[PDB]
Amino acid sequence: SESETLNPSARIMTFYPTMEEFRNFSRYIAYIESQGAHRAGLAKVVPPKEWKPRASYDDIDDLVIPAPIQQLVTGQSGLFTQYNIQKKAMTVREFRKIANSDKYCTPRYSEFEELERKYWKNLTFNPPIYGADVNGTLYEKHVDEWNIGRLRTILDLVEKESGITIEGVNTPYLYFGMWKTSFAWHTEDMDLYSINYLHFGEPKSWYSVPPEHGKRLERLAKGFFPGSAQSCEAFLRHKMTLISPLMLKKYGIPFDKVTQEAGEFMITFPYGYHAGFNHGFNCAESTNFATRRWIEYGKQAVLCSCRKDMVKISMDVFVRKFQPERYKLWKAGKDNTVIDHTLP
């Protein structure tokens, strides 16, 4: 098949759109999927040089991070659980001082390979503080291209039909990072896409497992954490589980890595597991989005069964609107559709 020949190694692809290609968001997403980008689980988009979401980041020192989290990591030899201790609210100025202080700052290093080794060697020591999950945008109001606060995808059908706002999902989140702050192995809520823009600062490094080997990572994770597997049908959604790339290689799980630098977008695709860490003080904005291709993923997403506050989106509106033939069959519980991860 044509889709199977495109990005056959399911390697992370990087795109450099011109201003003209960049303008239409959902069309650019269709385009990168036409090149097989979605096979990686992650893609990088470098916006055109003369594109800017904000004039200056010099006025945000007084921005409140209301729920900073200290990240206590426990484990050894490639397998870790991250526990999140919430600290009292702090401003960006308070945060950046701590981020750059001799205590928390990025170690000296030659190339990324050495910084990555320092990450995996030291991540259970000196628990860092992540300014994660902050409600807001750093985009200026007038910015029409790739505006994370208004992408205009069909995910907008959720609020449109129901009025329901899900923070970070159909609203933007800001993430102020410092050295060694991390994000655990997860796919998106409801196996949605995510967009992630690094406004400023040091890089954010990412790992990704192709959606086509996603179940292979889950099988590994369940074997490594059998107690968690029995408690919850989707324990990785707790976003507590860290697994080093050496551990993935040891068990034959395909994965790729990429480093996002200030000014670049990352796109994660439905069912693409990703994890990563920040190099130093930075700020990222992020939200979820959807395309028609996400819809079967949404329908088949396995959700966390042990927390009451987890994200669940009714699929009803999407199946009625975009799969009217299958609606009654899906309702009778007899829709046997198999997802083909390569297909755009």
């Binding site: 706002t165 979820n288 669940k312």
Partner: peptide
């Protein structure tokens, strides 16, 4: 609903 929920929260991310």
């Amino acid at each position: 609903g929920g929260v991310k």
